[PDB]
From Swiss-Prot:
GO cellular component, one term: extracellular region
Keywords linked to the UniProt accession: Cell wall biogenesis/degradation, Disulfide bond, Glycosidase, Hydrolase, Secreted, Signal
Subcellular location: Secreted
Disulphide bonds in the chain: 15-36, 89-99
Function: Involved in maceration and soft-rotting of plant tissue.
Family, as annotated: Belongs to the glycosyl hydrolase 28 family.
Matches recorded under InterPro entries: GH28_Enzymes, Glyco_hydro_28, Pectin_lyas_fold, Pectin_lyase_fold/virulence
UniProt cross-references to SUPFAM superfamilies, sorted A to Z: Pectin lyase-like
Assembly, per entry: Monomer.
Domain of life: Bacteria
Name under which the protein is recorded: Endo-polygalacturonase
GO biological process: carbohydrate metabolic process; cell wall organization
Lineage summary: Bacteria, Pseudomonadati, Pseudomonadota, Gammaproteobacteria, Enterobacterales
Pfam families the UniProt entry points to: Glyco_hydro_28
């Protein structure tokens, strides 16, 4: 659980109010963000249109963005607009870091993004610049075994007490929300909706960060609904609360594949419908590390193919990293439809010990166990 006391966010008062028209809004919004009083927000309201069309924006420390009901902040469908180097974006190669995110918050304290407007990434729209859309680059990347360069919606780095509240995030070209190398992130009443077939669209991913709360939110996307990660040479990921949520399509409430120190994760009251994986802890030989103190409770799943997944050899990658996963508990977890539980502890020195209290799976469900002991 998050070590902070976290209560429902309050929306900041506006410093400036902008009205949408048919012109490109990037510099108009950036200028407003650059002269906004600490603790206030730039407010995006309707004008002649209700859509603010923009390229990359930077969110200053202590400043927030407020998007009105019915208003959309939409990412331009242009690869050159998001590049960080000549021709680095909207291509498939050995990079993967060729595009800036739509909204980036670097070294911020008390910054935030508020709705109930929408942020639309236009992931599935043909680019003005290329023959394909952002999502169409994944097939190519997968089949060619390389990396696509597409923009993330919200990228937060080295920040403190960032807030994401009462807002909708749709059609993200890449991951929707990333909170990296920081401390204090609260996502509350956050709605994420991206097609189940769109690859590389993780919902909310804390990366080597501490003190995270994801509550009263609704996440339906293509890849991981939530993916908790910790990287070698960076901070440990600790103290996380995932409470009172609803997950739709996606790859699950996951931890990994980068598991270099993930501690004290509390998941309670989670409704899942159609997610391909339910509760997951995954890694491989290239990024496995310590995962300790993970507790799942009051989880109800419907139409989830793999309700519980603990896999230490998810993909076959080279490396000598060994998973040291312990103190993992499941309590009051129900799966209403036929599915498979995968428990694989290959590459772990000793059998992974897991506790399952009142875990009810249908009678036609299968358990695939390898080097892991289940205590009841």
């Amino acid at each position: 659980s998050d070590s902070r006391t976290v209560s429902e966010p309050k929306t900041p008062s506006s410093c400036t109010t902008l009205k949408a028209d048919s012109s490109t809004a990037t510099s108009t919004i950036q200028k407003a963000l650059n002269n906004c009083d600490q603790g206030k927000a730039v407010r995006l309201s309707a004008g002649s249109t209700s859509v603010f069309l923009s390229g990359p924006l930077s969110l200053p420390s202590g400043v927030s963005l407020l998007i009105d009901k019915g208003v959309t902040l939409r990412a331009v469908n242009n690869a050159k607009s998001f590049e960080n180097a000549p021709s680095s974006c909207g291509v498939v190669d050995k990079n993967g870091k060729g595009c800036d995110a739509f909204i980036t918050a670097v070294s911020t304290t008390n910054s935030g993004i508020y709705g109930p407007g929408t942020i639309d990434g236009q992931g599935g729209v043909k680019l003005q610049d290329k023959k394909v859309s952002w999502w169409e680059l994944a097939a190519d990347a997968k089949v060619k075994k390389l990396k696509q360069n597409t923009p993330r919606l919200i990228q937060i780095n080295k920040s403190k007490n960032f807030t994401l509240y009462n807002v909708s995030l749709i059609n993200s070209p890449n991951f929707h929300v990333v909170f990296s190398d920081g401390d204090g992130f609260t996502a509350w009443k956050t709605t994420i909706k991206t097609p189940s077939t769109a690859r590389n669209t993780d919902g909310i991913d804390p990366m080597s960060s501490k003190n995270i709360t994801i509550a009263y939110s609704n996440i339906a996307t293509g890849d991981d609904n939530v993916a908790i990660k910790a990287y070698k040479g960076r901070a440990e990921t600790r103290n996380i609360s995932i409470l009172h949520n609803d997950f739709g399509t996606g790859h699950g409430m996951s931890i990994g594949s980068e598991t270099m120190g993930v501690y004290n994760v509390t998941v309670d009251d989670l409704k899942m419908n159609g997610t391909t994986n339910g509760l997951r802890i995954k890694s491989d030989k290239s990024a496995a590390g310590v995962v300790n103190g993970v507790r799942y409770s009051n989880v109800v799943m419907k139409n989830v193919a793999k309700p519980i997944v603990i896999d230490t050899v998810y993909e076959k990658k080279e490396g000598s990293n060994v998973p040291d996963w312990s103190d993992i508990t499941f309590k009051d977890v129900t799966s209403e439809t036929k599915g498979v539980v995968v428990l694989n502890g290959e590459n772990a020195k000793k059998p992974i010990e897991v506790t399952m209290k009142n875990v009810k799976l249908t009678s036609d469900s299968t358990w695939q166990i390898k080097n892991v002991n289940v205590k009841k």
